[PDB]
Design a protein around this ligand. Structure first.
Ligand SMILES: CC(=O)N[C@@H](Cc1ccccc1Cl)C(=O)N1CCC[C@]12C=C[C@@H]1CC[C@@H](C(=O)N3CC[C@@H]4C=C[C@H]5[C@H](C)C[C@@H](C(=O)O)N5C(=O)[C@H]43)N1C2=O
Ligand SMILES: CC(=O)N[C@@H](Cc1ccccc1Cl)C(=O)N1CCC[C@]12C=C[C@@H]1CC[C@@H](C(=O)N3CC[C@@H]4C=C[C@H]5[C@H](C)C[C@@H](C(=O)O)N5C(=O)[C@H]43)N1C2=O
Ligand SMILES: CC(=O)N[C@@H](Cc1ccccc1Cl)C(=O)N1CCC[C@]12C=C[C@@H]1CC[C@@H](C(=O)N3CC[C@@H]4C=C[C@H]5[C@H](C)C[C@@H](C(=O)O)N5C(=O)[C@H]43)N1C2=O
Length: 113
């Protein structure tokens, strides 16, 4: 059930997607602002996903599988990004610590997939 899926990291970040047509970053879910972003581990099938919800109103702005082999790119010390088939995601972290802790947890997840 639900309890077999566990959060293994959370951080504060503004979630963005790249508008491939207009060549600009846009807020995930339509409104710019900070979200609480988790990496969840489904222990039964050993899969991971990233889920983020806006802090002010809990809107779900990202719910993204993390497949085996995903390339997680640290573009700057506070902006990280990865590819999904439908769009590129970016996380603008609220602090360097948020970014580094999230990235480490992501790299650990990628190495156990
Ligand atoms: C913040 C947090 O995780 N608290 C958990 C804390 C906790 C407590 C006990 C053990 C484990 C955990 Cl981790 C929580 O208190 N509980 C209460 C029981 C349930 C849960 C426990 C585990 C799962 C993990 C995953 C998350 C969940 O349910 N999530 C994430 C947001 C995501 C968003 C929307 C909905 C969508 C409508 C449908 C579906 C969709 O995304 O398809 N879905 C979701 O999947 C929604 N769980 C929980 O919330
Ligand atoms: C597999 C996959 O990645 N699929 C993507 C979506 C996708 C499918 C096919 C091709 C490309 C893409 Cl990109 C996905 O699921 N993504 C992309 C990031 C966001 C989301 C992740 C989670 C949440 C859960 C809720 C839902 C959501 O956000 N929906 C539903 C549609 C509905 C329409 C409009 C907007 C309105 C502007 C504001 C608000 C309003 O109605 O108030 N709203 C919404 O509520 C909007 N999510 C998503 O779409
Ligand atoms: C091979 C591959 O897939 N490559 C991807 C990246 C990637 C590599 C490996 C694995 C996965 C991925 Cl995903 C790629 O290159 N992609 C995917 C997204 C589009 C982009 C393509 C072109 C542009 C060029 C510029 C850069 C960009 O977007 N950058 C630069 C840093 C800079 C920092 C912050 C944000 C700021 C919050 C808003 C805005 C601002 O500064 O105004 N901004 C930015 O401008 C941000 N691009 C990209 O990243």
């Amino acid at each position: 059930g639900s309890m077999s899926e566990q959060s293994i990291c959370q951080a504060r970040a503004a979630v963005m997607v790249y508008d491939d047509a207009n060549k600009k970053w846009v807020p995930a879910g339509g409104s710019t602002g900070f979200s609480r972003v988790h990496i969840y581990h489904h222990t039964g099938n050993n899969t991971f996903r990233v889920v983020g919800r806006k802090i002010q109103d809990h809107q779900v702005v990202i719910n993204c599988a993390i497949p085996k082999g995903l390339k997680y790119n640290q573009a700057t010390q506070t902006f990280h990004q990865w590819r999904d088939a439908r769009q590129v995601y970016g996380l603008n972290f609220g602090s360097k610590e948020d970014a580094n802790v999230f990235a480490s947890a992501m790299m650990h997840a990628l190495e156990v997939l």
